[PDB]
C-alpha cells in the first residue's frame, strides 16, 4: 500500500529471485527473474503472491 | 549428442580396474573434452532440472586382439571424488589414467566423511554403505566388450530419484562406468591401445524455474 | 513530405533504442557486435500531388 | 553442375567491396577455375541461347567469427570491365582481390566510352547510367551472410532480355555479386580466413544455329 501527496507518480518492479550463490543485488540481475511491473497511479495496491516452488511435497 | 574422449586401453591396465561418467556432473567440467554447449549453460540460469538419458561406446579392437570390458549404468555412486570430499582435477585424470581396485573401494571405507573435531577421541573407520562389489555389477543394466564381437555401447535408463526432482548443481543418480573384465593382449602390428569413446543424450528434460547464471558460493 | 521550416504537420517527435541490461560476454568469443536497422512503407502508405525533380545528383 | 573457386576472405577487406561473376561470360575466361566442359564449347558452336540460371554459395566461418556478407543477382551490370573498355586479366584478378568501392562506381563515371576524336573539344564526364548504389542492393533477390548462421547461397533467377534471345558472345543480362557487409573479425586460432566457393547451374536451355567454332575476328 501506498501513501504519499497528491501530484506525484512513479513506477515500481517487484520480482522475486530462487536460491543462488548470494542474493541478486542490481535490478539488471534481477530483471533476469520473475518479475511484475506496479505503476504509482494505477492502483495503490498491486497484490504479490510467491509462486510455490520445491522439490519435495511440503518445507521446514 | 555430447561426445567425450577417454583414456587409451593398454595392456599394463590390470583388471577390475574402471573409470566412471558421472551425468549431469562430469558436464560442468567438460569431462572428457565434452561442450554440450546449450544444455551446460541452460543449467545455470536454472535450478531444477528433471530428464532421462541414453549413452554409447566405442572400441576397436582387431582380428589378432583379445580381451573383456564391462560397462554398466549405476546409479547413486560416489566414486567420482577423492577421499577427503573433493572432486579430482584433470592433471590428476590424466595421472592415474584409470580407477584401481582397492580394499578402501571394496569396502566404502574412504568415502568423504565429516571430521568430528577436537570434542571426540578418534574412531577407527571399518566400512561405509556405498562399498563396491566388482562382481556382481553385472546385476544392474550393463553389457559386454569382447575383442571379438564388440561393437558399441547402448542404453536407456529412465529417471530416478529422492524426489521428483532435484537440484542441478548437486543431483547425482545416474552414472556410466567401465570395467577391463580380462587384460588387453594383442600381436603387435594391428591397432595398438585403442582409444574409447563416449556419447550422451538426455531424453524428455524439463528445465525449472528463471534466474541469473548461477554464482560460486 | 519536405520540411522548409519546422512545423507540427512535418516533424512528428523521434524514435530512439535503449539498451535494458548489459549482455554477456562469453569465453574467448570476440567483441563489439553489429546491428543493422532497416525501413520500409506501411501498408497504408501513400504520397500525393507530384511534382518536378532536383537534378542536383547530376553534380 | 560448373563449381569455381573466388579469393579468400580477409580481415583487411574493407567494407563495401565486392567481386562478381557474370554468367555465362566468365566461362570463356574458366573464371575461377571453372570448366564446363559441354556448354562451354557447345555455345561456341552456335550463336544464339535461351536459358535461366541457379547458383550457390558457401563459407565456412567458426564459433569465434563474426561479419556480415551481402549476395545478390544484379542484372544488366557492366561492372566486369575495365574503364577503358577491355576485360580484366588473370594477373589483375589476382592482384586486385576485390573490388573497392570508388565515386566513378558509385557514379558510373569511369564506364567504358568511345573517344570523340580530334574533331570535338574534350568533354568532362560527369556521370552514367550505371552507378552503383550500395545500400539499395538488398532490392533485388538476395541473401545475408552473418559468421553465425551463413550457410549457403540459393537463388533461381528466371530468363529476361531485350529480346527473347540473344547472342552468346555478347549477351550479358544477369550476374552475381558478393558483397562485404561487416569487415570480417575473428579470434585466432578457428578457420582464418575462410575460402569462397560458388557453384552455377542453367536451366531450360535452347541453343541455336549450327556453325564451325567461332572464330575470332
Redesign the interface.
Known sequence: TFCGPMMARGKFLLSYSPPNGTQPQTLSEAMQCTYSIWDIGLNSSWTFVVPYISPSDYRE | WYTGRLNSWTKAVKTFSFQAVPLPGAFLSRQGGLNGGAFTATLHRHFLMKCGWQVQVQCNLTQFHQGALLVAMVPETTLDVKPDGKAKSLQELNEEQWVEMSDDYRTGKNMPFQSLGTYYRPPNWTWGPNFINPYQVTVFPHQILNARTSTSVDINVPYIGETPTQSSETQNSWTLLVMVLVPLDYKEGATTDPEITFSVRPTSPYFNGLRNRYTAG | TRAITNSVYSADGWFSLHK???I?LPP???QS??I?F?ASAGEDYTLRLPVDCNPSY??
Open positions: 535494458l541490461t548489459k554477456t574467448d568469443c570476440p557486435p553489429c543493422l532497416f547530376v553534380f
